[PDB]
Structure formats: structure tokens, C-alpha cells
RNA sequence: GUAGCGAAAGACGGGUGAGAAUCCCGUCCACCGAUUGACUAAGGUUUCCAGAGGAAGGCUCGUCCGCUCUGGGUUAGUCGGGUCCUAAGCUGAGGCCGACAGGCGUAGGCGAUGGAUAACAGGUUGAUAUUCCUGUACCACCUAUAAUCGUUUUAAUCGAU
RNA sequence: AGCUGUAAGUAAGCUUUGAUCCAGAGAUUUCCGAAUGGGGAAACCCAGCAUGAGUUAUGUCAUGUUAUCGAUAUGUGAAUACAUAGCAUAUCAGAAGGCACACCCGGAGAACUGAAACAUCUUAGUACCCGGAGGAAGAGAAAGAAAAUUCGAUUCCCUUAGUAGCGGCGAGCGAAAUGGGAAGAGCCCAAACCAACAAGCUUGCUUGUUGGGGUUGUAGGACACUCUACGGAGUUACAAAGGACGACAUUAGACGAAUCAUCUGGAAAGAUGAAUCAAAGAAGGUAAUAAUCCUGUAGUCGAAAAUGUUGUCUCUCUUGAGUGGAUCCUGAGUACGACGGAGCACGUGAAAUUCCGUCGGAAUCUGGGAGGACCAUCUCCUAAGGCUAAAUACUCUCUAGUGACCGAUAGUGAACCAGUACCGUGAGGGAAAGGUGAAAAGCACCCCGGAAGGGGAGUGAAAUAGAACCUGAAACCGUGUGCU
């Protein structure tokens, strides 16, 4: 479960093995966006504050299983779990301990 | 209640009622004197005039 | 009350030939009566009126893509004014 | 503020309610004559009218416990 | 590719258009004329008026409205209704009757198709007009204004339950 | 850490002071509708009174209030002199009126049908009309049934048995006695007693009022005989502990398992190599089929009204004082029966329970009285005089949580715009149509006619996968080529 600065590896899908950083969320579909990712191509016609318009070479969102955070001790994909600490929960990285992650 | 049979000879049946035998009489109601229907049973033995 | 009461100012052709007299339209609460709609008017925007006339206009069908349905009843007030102007653009 | 409305003395909040309420007045009016631009103020001033509303509601109800 | 296309007189010139027996303008001809004319009811409910495309709609086309957008558009002291009056009826406290549900009925209520009640001339829009504007009036109510009636019984006033 | 429902995208704000969300508590809540100020063709019209704002004043506006019977205190009080009614008040408005009519109890109650109509009978005390309550009623601590050696205060629900019986002895209808589940929980008026009150009365008595007393007798009480009380304790009831009453559920709930990497088409979730940590280790939903992504399952703590609700649970209980039944009491138009009918399995009668109308009329300790025809023996009551318990019924869909099931002419008429289009004056009748996601990435871009095409273009792992991305088939029908 993943946050809108990190640094991701993805698991699944035609690019794989590549890395990257996500952009945007959109948690209530499941779909994360991550830089250099799932790019498409979009005919976009001429807009009233625009030219006539490009191929529009933007990311697409991908689902947010096919992607998996990095331990930062080891740079292995890995899971998360919870930590408690002080009545703040942090997210540790289950093979080792903490990532740090604001941005 | 009060309904039930009459029968003919052959058994035949029609519903049919039995009414009480009311009377207008002039009771003693709460405060006034006052006419009302009270069947002939009733006054028999119960209720005065 | 008294600011409830008038609710929007009518920008037409007809209200703009009306202004060139002292005469302006507004749409109202559909409640109000004329008494209120001059009180109203000469509370808030501190004028004399002359004289108010007033209509109802009923509901209007309407449709949008297999979606048929009515618009609000509206309740058209059109008031002279004595003296004073009103600045609205 | 809506913390510390309900620390105004009941007729600060009668004034605000009534200036509140001349601020949507003329906001609703200049949506009309089409120069407004900003439309989410609209929305603001009426939950303000309500907060307003709210505690000027609540002080009564409090006010009669006693009583 | 059959039946049918729902009574009736149209012709030509111009225009507009991607395209006209069809739309618009013109001229001539024709039809109804106690009406196929002009108003008012009931009823219907935006069909009314401007723009612009009509993919369908019309026993064509759109190059109209009865699809889209709004631009819209209905203004009353006096017009027609309610704040008045009652008819036929319908309801009806108490009352009478009735297995129940309920029926009838008194004063009273409600109820126009009837009674009562004050406005006309001109101007003006694409779309309303006895409503808007201009003139001239009329009818009510409220408050000030003054001479007049001055047992307030009476007195023109009040005024019946 | 995002958000601005569905019914999408800006302005936007939030905001780390915690948004949007999720539970709980409150505040606001137009108008109609028992609608209840009066009226009315629901969603409208017209008022009054009292305050308040405004106004020179009216008009206007705002806020309260204004529909029958009960209770407190009364007050007045026409035909007819007071009274009392009625009456007009003042108050609580008290209380009526709100129903899934599925179950329940009552009232009233068909017919087609069966018999190879039927008319007796059956259908059937059925439909659904009306009224009640409701989370039931009935019954009941017995004139209770059982008839052996009784029995279980009752009571109500799954064996006898298609038996006994009833029956144009036809068609058909159709028991009970002899028990499992669950289980008792006892109250009145009556007898006299006593103490006050008043009235009559002449203070004697009587009348009545308030209270303790007692509810079954092969006796209870005044008594008449004889000598004990909080022993136990007890809330579903009559004393309640209303209690700190000792866990509502430990219910909101939310946090909270543990796995995985490599190679060949988009990816493995195919072939290699590994693994899971104990109460989970169990299923099941995600461009590729993770008992180890969302999550549960296990564990955690657990908060409002919560308190398992208890083993002292304040008050406070009821230790029972044993004999007789000898005299009194034991329930009134009544037991008690005739006449018409109904319900009892039973076709009304030779009837042991109910209704109408008429009759009438008992008894007391030598008691009386009652029990599918009469007199002696057996069981019962101390019927009618009265009552009231729980365990005993039942689920629109309430609510949540689940399954050789509906798999969508479907549990549904309707998993889409559905009681909607539409049809009918009205009661009413009543459809069709469902279905990406791999991701709109929905043919920018660009070129010839409005529609529609031809090209390229594409997120396109594949557009004869172009709005008929649920794909998507068939057949009927087509239509243009041709071999004979």
C-alpha cells in the first residue's frame, strides 16, 4: 500500500523490471501512475486554447498490484506491514526496518 | 351472535336472525331520568325504572 | 425577509427596453405578494417605486436524452420606479 | 472563527448573520449580470449562515436548562 | 413496385440554395362569402415569437414549425373569478335508525348555470395589452384639513340581534 | 491524504489546527396528508386573537394560538321557584386516531364444485368484508378432567388410526382415552372480628363507610380448643434490594498474519528452484488460477445507552402454631329446565357445551349440589361469584450473517429508464430493453462529399475487436460471381 512519492519497482505488465516514482493515486479505483510507465499515445484534437494537437505521449494508470515498494536497505521489491510507534503508525518494510518516505 | 337457521320441512336452511325483545322504558341513568331500549329479560331483575 | 424576497435581476431585450424607462424586472420568491416586492426593493437598493406588476409562469417541459422533465415555476416581478436608479450592469 | 463564534456575545453573531447575508446577496446577484467568476464563494457564505445559525440555536437551548 | 396517397385552380417571372411542381417575393387568375370571415366559452397545455443544423417527424424537401438553443415571451383598484348572495344538490354538532361497515336528518355550512359590483380614447412590440405609456375619468379605504348638528336621550349621526 | 453523491469534468477550498469518509449524539426540518382555525376540485384559498417589527397611520409582514369526550375546582343555570343538569370556563391535554391484515382472536359469510346437478350432505365455516388487540390468545390453579389401584394446578405443540363413530349409512366426514418438549406462581369478594367516622337514631342500636381477616371441605374462619415468625429468604406477581446490584454483547468495532523468485508470447498464476509460522494454515474476489496483493480467519484492546446479571444483594420476608367441619360462609333471574337454532367427528335428537324468547325457582353439616336416558355405589365443586402466570403462536421483509439454489422468460412484472412507456372516464391492466475495461487509449495528426466512405494512425498481446468494446453465432432471408 503505496503513497504518492515513492520509489517503486513494477512487478507486472510490459514494462517490468523498470522502476519509477508515482505521480498521482486515484485510490478508489486502484490505479497508480508512475513516471516513464504504461505510456500512451493520444489523439487529442485542436482544443480552443491549444493548436491542433499532438500525440499526446503521457503515462496511463496502472493497477496498483503490479508495483511494489523497495526496501531501502537492499533495493528488493517487498511488502509492507505496520509498526506502532508513539500512537503513530509507521510502515516498516518486512525484511528489514523502517522506509522513510514524505516525498 | 345471534344468527343461525331456519329450516323447512325437507331441511332446507336460510340464515336468519334472533333478536332480543327490547322495550322503550324510562330508567334511572346517571342524573337524569332517561328513555332507553331494554330488552324484557333485563328488567326482569335488573335494572330499575 | 426582505433580501430572500427578490432573487435574481432578468437581463433580456424586452427588460433592457423596460430600463430605458425606469422600469426593471427581477424574479421573486414565488410566495411574495407585490407589497413585498416594493417594500423590498425600495428597503435594499434605497429608492421611491411608483407602481409593481407582477406573473406567474407555469413550468416549462423540457428534455435531455431520453430524460424529460419540467422547469421551476417563476414568479416575474416588474417594478417603476419614481425617482432614484438602479445600478446593475 | 467557528470555534470562537460561539465565543461572540449573541449579537455579534446577530449583525454577522445579517452581513453574511447581504454578501450572498449580491454575490447571487452579480452571478446574474454575468461577473462573477469566482462561484465557490456562493457556497461558502451559505455554510457560514449555518454555522451561524447553529450556535445562535444551541445558547437557547442552554439558556432554558438553567430556566 | 401492386392498391392507395383523404373533396377544392392555378400560371409565369424573380430570388435563395449542394440541390426547388414544393420555400420566399411579385403580377395575373381563381374559391369561400349567414362563411373555409371576425370574436367569446369549454377543452388542450408552450403548439406562441426569433435565430440556426434538422440524423428521425410530415402519405416531399428544409431551402418550416409542432426536434435544439435560448432570445425568449403572458403586466389589471375598473376585464373574468375569490376576499359577496343564495337554487338544485352535497354535507351536517346534538338527534333517530342500524349485525359491523354504515343510513337518514336539525340549525348551520358548502354550492352558479342566476342576483350584486368602479374605464374609456389614442400610441406602441418579433412576441401582451380596457393590463404597458399618454390623456381624461370613476370606485373604495386610511390619515390630516376646516365652518357646521351640538340634554348626546334626542338630534340630519350612530342604529338593531 | 485526498476530495467536491449518483447525475462527469472547472473554479476550488480543505489541510497536518486533520478535509472527504465511518459509527454515535444533537440542531434545522417549507407544503399537503386523523389534518384538527374555517373552507376546498391534496400539495391551495380565506380568517381571528395576542404579541412584535414597520408605518403619521392603515394596509403589510413575522412569531405563537384557535377541531370531541375524560380529570381538577367549579360556576351560572329556559319551558317551571331553588337545585342539579346542561352551561361557559380555567387548566393536564389526559386519551382517542398510527397495522406487513403474514400469523392470532372475534362478527358476518357465498358460489362454481363432488355426488357422475343435487335440495339433505359436500365445497366450507373456505373466500375476504368488517372489528380488535398484538408481539398473542385461550386456559388455569377447577361442579378440573381420568374411570385403574386414579391422575400432572393447568396448559399448549410432533403415537393410537383412517380405528371408534357419523352418513340420501350415499359421496364423504372423522375422534378421544392410555405420553415426549416445557413445567407450575396464586389472587378475590363470603363468614364473623375490630377500630374509628358520620348519619339516622336517641346515642343504645342500626345503617353504611375506611381498613386487617380468607379463598377451598372426607374443612376455612368467629371461634372452640394450642402455643410461633424472619426459619427460609428472592423480583415474571402479590414486601421490593431502585440497590456498589458483581460479565448486556464484551455488542460499535476498528486495528492486526505468515511467500516467491527465474526463464518462452502482455504478463506465470506452464516448466525450474524454493517457501508459509501458529488459535489464522479457511474460503473467496485483483492485463496470468498469491489455502502467504484486498482481505479475512486468529489475536488485540476493547465505549454510548452497556453492566453475565449475580454468591451479602438496603428496605424487608412468611418458622404455620396442632384438634374438630358441631353452628355460620362458600357466590342469583341463578344452578335448575321447555320451546327454536348453532357448535361439538357426530345430519339437534334420547343429548353432556353456547344463543334468542319464556319459565321460574335450591340448599346448608341430617350440607346441599354437578358429571351423552333412571335410581344405589365412584370422582368432583366447594360450580354460576370473580380473577389473573411464564414456558405458548408467528416472520413484510426488520436487521445482520450464510448455502448440488434463481442463474437473469430468474427466486421478480421489474438486478437497464419499472409499477415506468403505454392503454383505460374510472376501478384497473401492464411491456420491451440488461450486460469493455488490458487500458478510451474513442480514429490528434493528416489528406477526397453533409451523411457515409478510402487511406494512413493508435493506446491496438489481436478493430470484418469503431460506440451493435457483453463479444457473438445460426437460420430465414440474401445479393453480386461463377462450374455444369
Same mark, same amino acid.
Given at each position: 500500500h503505496i503513497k504518492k512519492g515513492d520509489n517503486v519497482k513494477v512487478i507486472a505488465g510490459k514494462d517490468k523490471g523498470k522502476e519509477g516514482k508515482v505521480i498521482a493515486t486515484l485510490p478508489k479505483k486502484d490505479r497508480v501512475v508512475v513516471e516513464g510507465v504504461n505510456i500512451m499515445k493520444k489523439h487529442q484534437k485542436p482544443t480552443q486554447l491549444n493548436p491542433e494537437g499532438g500525440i499526446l505521449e503521457t503515462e496511463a494508470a496502472i493497477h496498483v498490484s503490479n508495483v511494489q515498494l523497495l526496501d531501502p536497505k537492499t533495493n528488493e521489491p517487498t511488502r509492507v506491514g505496520y509498526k506502532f510507534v508513539d500512537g503513530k503508525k509507521v510502515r516498516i518494510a518486512k525484511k528489514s526496518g523502517e522506509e522513510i518516505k514524505s516525498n | 351472535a345471534s344468527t343461525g337457521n331456519r329450516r323447512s320441512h325437507a331441511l332446507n336452511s336460510t340464515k336468519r336472525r334472533w333478536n332480543?325483545? /327490547?322495550?322503550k322504558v324510562?330508567? /334511572?341513568?346517571?342524573?337524569?331520568?332517561?328513555?332507553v331500549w331494554v330488552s324484557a329479560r333485563a328488567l326482569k331483575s335488573g335494572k330499575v325504572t | 425577509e426582505a433580501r430572500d424576497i427578490l432573487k435574481?435581476?432578468?437581463?433580456?431585450?424586452?427588460?433592457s427596453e423596460a430600463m430605458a424607462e425606469d422600469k426593471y424586472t427581477f424574479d421573486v420568491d414565488t410566495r411574495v405578494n407585490k407589497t413585498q416586492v416594493k417594500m423590498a426593493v425600495e428597503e435594499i437598493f434605497n429608492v421611491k417605486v411608483a407602481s409593481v406588476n407582477i406573473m406567474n409562469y407555469k413550468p416549462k417541459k423540457k428534455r435531455?436524452?431520453?430524460?424529460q422533465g419540467y422547469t421551476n415555476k417563476r414568479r416575474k416581478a416588474i417594478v417603476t420606479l419614481k425617482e432614484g436608479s438602479i445600478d446593475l450592469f | 472563527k467557528a470555534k470562537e463564534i460561539r465565543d461572540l456575545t449573541t449579537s455579534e453573531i446577530e449583525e454577522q448573520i445579517k452581513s453574511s447575508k447581504e454578501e450572498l446577496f449580491n454575490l447571487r446577484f452579480q452571478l446574474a449580470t454575468g461577473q462573477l467568476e469566482e462561484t465557490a464563494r456562493i457556497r461558502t457564505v451559505r455554510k457560514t449562515? *449555518?454555522?451561524?445559525?447553529?450556535? *445562535?440555536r444551541e445558547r437557547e437551548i442552554e439558556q432554558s436548562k438553567a430556566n
Open positions: - | 332480543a325483545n /327490547l322495550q324510562r330508567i /334511572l341513568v346517571d342524573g337524569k331520568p332517561k328513555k | 435574481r435581476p432578468v437581463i433580456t431585450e424586452k427588460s435531455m436524452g431520453r430524460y | 449562515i *449555518a454555522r451561524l445559525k447553529t450556535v *445562535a
